[PDB]
Amino acid sequence: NNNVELSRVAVSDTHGEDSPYFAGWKAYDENPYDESHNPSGVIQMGLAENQVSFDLLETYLEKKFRENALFQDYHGLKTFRQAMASFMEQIRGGKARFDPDRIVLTAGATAANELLTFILADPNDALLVPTPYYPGFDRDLRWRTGVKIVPIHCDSSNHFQITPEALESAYQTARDANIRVRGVLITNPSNPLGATVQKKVLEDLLDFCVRKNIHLVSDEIYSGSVFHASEFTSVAEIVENIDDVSVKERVHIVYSLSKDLGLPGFRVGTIYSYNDNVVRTARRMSSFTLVSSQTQHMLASMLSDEEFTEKYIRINRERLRRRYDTIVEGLKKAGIECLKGNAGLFCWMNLGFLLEKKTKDGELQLWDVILKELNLNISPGSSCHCSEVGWFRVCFANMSENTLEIALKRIHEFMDRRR
Amino acid sequence: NVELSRVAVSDTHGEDSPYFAGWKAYDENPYDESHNPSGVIQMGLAENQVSFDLLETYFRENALFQDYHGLKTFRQAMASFMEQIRGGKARFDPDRIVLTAGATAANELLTFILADPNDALLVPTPYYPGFDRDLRWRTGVKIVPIHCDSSNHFQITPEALESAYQTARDANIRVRGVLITNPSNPLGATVQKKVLEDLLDFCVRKNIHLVSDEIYSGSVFHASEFTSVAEIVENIDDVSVKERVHIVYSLSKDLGLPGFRVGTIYSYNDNVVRTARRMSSFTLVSSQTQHMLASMLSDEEFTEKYIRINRERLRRRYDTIVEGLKKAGIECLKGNAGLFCWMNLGFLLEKKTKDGELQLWDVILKELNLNISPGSSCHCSEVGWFRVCFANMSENTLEIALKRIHEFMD
Ligand SMILES: Cc1ncc(COP(=O)(O)O)c(C/N=C(\C=C\OCCN)C(=O)O)c1O
Ligand SMILES: Cc1ncc(COP(=O)(O)O)c(C/N=C(\C=C\OCCN)C(=O)O)c1O
């Protein structure tokens, strides 16, 4: 006899925890920085969390049960989905409108993307994802679904943006390889690039999805963190300009309050689908990952406070843009370039010029030095499947001004030695 | 036009079914004491309101906490709360507690961990209709029934386990475990300690898993009649036996908090613990909710008394409905736990068939404006049985519902 057996999924490494993204976070837990009693400790810059605006929520909740405890309906509180739909309209500046009856809540966007993948792709089918992308997709999209990721290659020529030749090449290469493609999943604005997607690129992408008869999933979890509202194009805007419901039926939006509101612990995700069958199916499936009715009830009033949401979103954009400029201008003093970003909680930092040669193990060696001599946890670009080595994602939104300044000192101090 | 996955177009969502057709019909004309007492009274939903008044009489760091270990305070509260429910007959290490969004998530997640697509789990009939979705819809895993009949109050026998296993072998389906409900839904009955030990020996001999969904453990009328598989493991000394036992629990039924989506897996298998915790990223409990409940669920004073009083009211509510149904000439199976009774209407049947049972089920939904669950939606092997929920309603509403059934038998 042998030890009682677990499933293939259970012994698979697709949980993604043998990886630089997880090891650097682990190195942070063993020696965390602290201004007062460990200024030599590891500064956490590898986690995309937003604390720069959190005082607005603290100030707001200061100034202001049986029903929710019994409410477990898979639609979610009608009151909260109105708050969510209105909050999403405010993020997009009225260039889109959201019917609360189409809102499906999930425990964060982690749940939403896996759920949508269950709905749009069979096991052994594939989704196209532009590189570089959020390492967590390698778990979220694949671990339990049997679905595969086919990369859409992007390089620095066009600032890592989708080109029609890369969409056609990724699709056709897979189709010639007897891999069935079911859709494209994009991050808009991008993680890890911190960059909006240009409107015409999204329009060509939607046209491409029509021509191949595939789906378009747009993960817009950083939409409220675009530095300037007018530079963001949600796929909702491209679809609102179309009454052809035959076209609408393939577009789905993933959103979450984890990044824009800085509430990751509350696990508020949503799917907004223009496909009525996906809505009905996603909602039944959300039974496996429902949002606490307590937090829905708490957040509903705050997220419907049109006065407060207008102010929060405006101010959150400015503080993130302000941190982006702080860190990008700090790195330029040290002789380090970043991609020009216009959104998100992270900058995309080019260190390829410090490498042995453009190889993967050279990037990890450098990452090891930044993690052990500089005591900074940042994410190596190859764990985001970047096509060029030496790029690093650096998060700037989860820390105090001074902690960012000290982190900048260590890097500036490190470049002086290497010259 | 776009294609969706087989999972998306599948019937396994289970809503083209009487359990959800009657729950539907309730929404179109819902009862309300104030402005519609002729409306549909909901008796098809196992929810517990009878003890909620006891709860009523009783930030930056939380918002940022998204760790899949869960709050340590809340894992401590859950573990001590689960020990109090079992009367100290078992001990729960808070470090092994894995939280999920309800037991709905927990059973599906465990199914992902314990069985491959196209393998099977054995499930005793009758069983919770939601399992037909939860264990199968996204997992590709099959349910092979363990048949039970009324001769022994629908309890598992060593023989039924073995022929059920043989049935899967004939279909070239590999059995990976048995999932039981302890106490039973829809029977409302504890499982005898002897039966659980014989079940565990069967799982050892076939080297398969045993999942015990004990979401109704706090609703056993007389605490000593309940045997958790945790008590049986507490006194086993072979690790080969322990390693296959996993407990699912939730605060939805015993505490009446279904909306907060607090589920847990307590597994005696360290790799299931670690895998369940990684997999719980897809279905985490709100940290706000963990925090609020940690203080309440660690107040052993309040919890010891809450558990005691909830047992007494569910027993009396059980007595109210079963004695109400007997007055109308209807027998219920002898139950001792849960939020529902198991009602035999087999004598009003047109043809001792499944078609006949649903036809009769249609009458109670239309004419009586009562949603109750037909036993064939629980895969009962005998026709004419119905699950009737009694804890999701007021005193007044239950009396009104009984009166409607009483008149129908006239
Ligand atoms: C593009 C994208 N989608 C979904 C998620 C999941 O977020 P949720 O709504 O479940 O809270 C992330 C989280 N981004 C990160 C994940 C951090 O770990 C926590 C995962 N919940 C990151 O550091 O890049 C993300 O970047
Ligand atoms: C044995 C069992 N396990 C798990 C669950 C789900 O519990 P939760 O996910 O809240 O922790 C139920 C709910 N059973 C019912 C609840 C249904 O509500 C709607 C979802 N089907 C029922 O009517 O039998 C159950 O009976």
**Taking the domains of chain A in order of start, what are their residue ranges?**
1-63+306-415, 64-305
Is the CB–ligand 2 distance for residue B252 below 6 Å?
yes
Q: Chain A within 8 Å of B292 (Cβ-Cβ)?
A: yes
DSSP reduced 3-state for B369: coil
Atom 22, ligand 1: residue with shortest CA distance: A48
Number of helices (H), then strands (E), in chain B: 16, 13
Q: Among A249, A10, A284, which residue's Cα sits nearest to residue A120?
A: A249
Q: What is the DSSP letter of A225?
A: G
Contact B129, B378 (CB under 8 A): yes
CA distances, B101 to each of A3, B109, B152, B251, B379 (Å)? 29, 10, 35, 10, 26
Contact B285, B101 (CB under 8 A): yes
Residue pointed to by tokens 């939280």? B99
Q: Chain B within 8 Å of A201 (Cβ-Cβ)?
A: no
Catalytic residue status for B372: no
The nearest CA of chain B is from the CA of A222 a distance in Å of 17
CA distances, A202 to each of A208, A250, A254 (Å)? 10, 13, 16
Helix axes of B270-279 and B102-114: crossing angle, nearest 10 degrees: 120
Scanning A159-188 for CB atoms below 8 A from B yields: 182
Q: Among A123, A118, A126, A144, which residue's Cα sits nearest to residue A284?
A: A118
DSSP reduced 3-state for A44: strand
> Which of A51, A267, A291 has the highest number of chain B CBs within 10 A, making it the mutation to test binding with B?
A267
> Which of A104, A292, A299 has the highest number of chain B CBs within 10 A, making it the mutation to test binding with B?
A292
Cα angle A138, A142, A143 (rounded to 5 degrees) comes to 100
Tokens of B242: 């322990």
Contact B268, B98 (CB under 8 A): no
Count, residues in chain B: 410
Contact B126, B187 (CB under 8 A): yes
> Could you tell me the resolution of this structure in angstroms?
2.2
Tokens of A91: 């993020």
Scanning B209-228 for CB atoms below 8 A from A yields: 209
d(CA B22, CA B294): 36
d(CA A127, CA B383): 46
What is the experimental method?
Answer: X-ray
Catalytic residue status for B330: no
Q: A51 alpha carbon to ligand 1 midpoint, in Å?
A: 15
Q: Chain B within 8 Å of A74 (Cβ-Cβ)?
A: no
Cα angle A248, A254, A260 (rounded to 5 degrees) comes to 130
d(CA A186, CA A266): 24
Q: What are phi and psi of A173, to 5 degrees?
A: -65, -40
Give binding residues of A for substrate as ranges.
49, 74
Query: Which strands sit side by side in the sheet containing B340-344, from one edge to the other?
Result: B331-332, B340-344, B385-389, B373-374
d(CA A232, CA A223): 7
Q: B371 alpha carbon to ligand 2 midpoint, in Å?
A: 16
Atom of ligand 2 nearest to the CA of B263: 11
Consult the annotation and say whether B249 binds a ligand.
no
> Which of B61, B119, B281, B291 has the highest number of chain A CBs within 10 A, making it the mutation to test binding with A?
B281
Residue among A10, A107, A119 minimizing CB distance to B284: A107
Is the CB–ligand 1 distance for residue A44 below 6 Å?
no
Q: Is A26 exposed, middle or buried (0-12, 13-18, 19+ CB in 10 A)?
A: exposed
Which residues of A belong to the active site? 134, 219, 221, 259
Q: B53 alpha carbon to ligand 2 midpoint, in Å?
A: 22
User: Residues followed by a break in chain B, C–N over 2.5 Å?
Assistant: 58
Residue among B64, B119, B243 minimizing CB distance to A265: B64
The C-alpha R_g of chain A, in whole angstroms, comes to 21
d(CA B275, CA B272): 5
User: How many C-beta atoms lie closer than 10 Å to residue B157's C-beta?
Assistant: 17
**Among A25, A50, A133, A134, residue to substitute to test ligand 1 (most atoms within 8 Å of Cβ):** A134
Tell if the CB–CB gap between A267 and B66 is shorter than 8 Å: yes
- H/E stretch holding B398 reads helix B395-408
Contact B341, B390 (CB under 8 A): yes
Is the CB–ligand 2 distance for residue B130 below 6 Å?
yes
Q: Chain B within 8 Å of A51 (Cβ-Cβ)?
A: yes
Q: Which residues pair with A269 in a beta bridge?
A: A106, A256
Q: Among B314, B340, B303, B304, which residue's Cα sits nearest to residue B325?
A: B340
d(CA B216, CA B352): 31
Is the CB–ligand 2 distance for residue B87 below 6 Å?
no
The nearest CA of chain B is from the CA of A354 a distance in Å of 35
Tell if the CB–CB gap between A278 and B208 is shorter than 8 Å: no
- H/E stretch holding B86 reads none
Tell if the CB–CB gap between A4 and B207 is shorter than 8 Å: yes
Scanning B95-134 for CB atoms below 8 A from A yields: 101-102, 104-105, 108, 112-117, 119, 133-134
Q: Among B136, B139, B133, B104, which residue's Cα sits nearest to residue B14?
A: B133
d(CA A285, CA B3): 18
CA distances, B77 to each of A181, A252, B290 (Å)? 47, 39, 10
d(CA A357, CA B6): 47
Is the CB–ligand 1 distance for residue A269 below 6 Å?
yes
Catalytic residue status for B215: yes
Q: A110 alpha carbon to ligand 1 midpoint, in Å?
A: 6
